[PDB]
Design a protein around this ligand. Structure first.
Ligand code: FES
Length: 141
């Protein structure tokens, strides 16, 4: 079966793990308290794309910070590392003007929940089928 199983036991706050799945990067960021608070401080009305783009929940779900992470605590942000404009790999480590990712191909800025805030990309970075299957492992797909 296609599903893969990622050990995240050693991922510390402020670290992104990048894993290849279906030929493309998946970003698994363990968010800092700053990342989480900032994500939760954004009103839906401020967003370019109000859809959660999240395979795990209703396709009409709103792009609240809570609908962008795997866990209620908001520590685990898992998304395709594929810019929704033309597919370049967004640069992380708190890059760009919105405390998240910057796609250097045509200048798209994503926030700390991977939501599009500035530039040509039309959509928030999509979230794959992903869930914890115990304390230390995320199943993708
Ligand atoms: S591919 Fe990301 S801004 Fe164009």
């Amino acid at each position: 079966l296609a599903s893969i199983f990622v050990d995240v036991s050693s991922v510390e706050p402020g670290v992104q793990l990048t894993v290849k799945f279906l030929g493309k990067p998946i970003f698994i960021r363990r968010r800092t308290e700053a990342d989480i608070e900032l994500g939760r401080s954004v009103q839906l009305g401020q967003l370019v794309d109000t859809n959660a783009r999240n395979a795990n929940i209703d396709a009409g779900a709103e792009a609240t910070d809570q609908n962008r992470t795997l866990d209620e605590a908001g520590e685990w942000l898992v998304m395709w590392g594929v810019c929704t404009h033309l597919g370049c790999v967004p640069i992380g480590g708190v890059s760009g003007d919105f405390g998240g990712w910057f796609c250097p191909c045509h200048g798209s800025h994503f926030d700390s929940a991977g939501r599009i805030r500035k530039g040509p990309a039309p959509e928030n970075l999509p979230i794959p089928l992903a869930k914890f299957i115990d304390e230390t492992t995320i199943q993708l797909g």
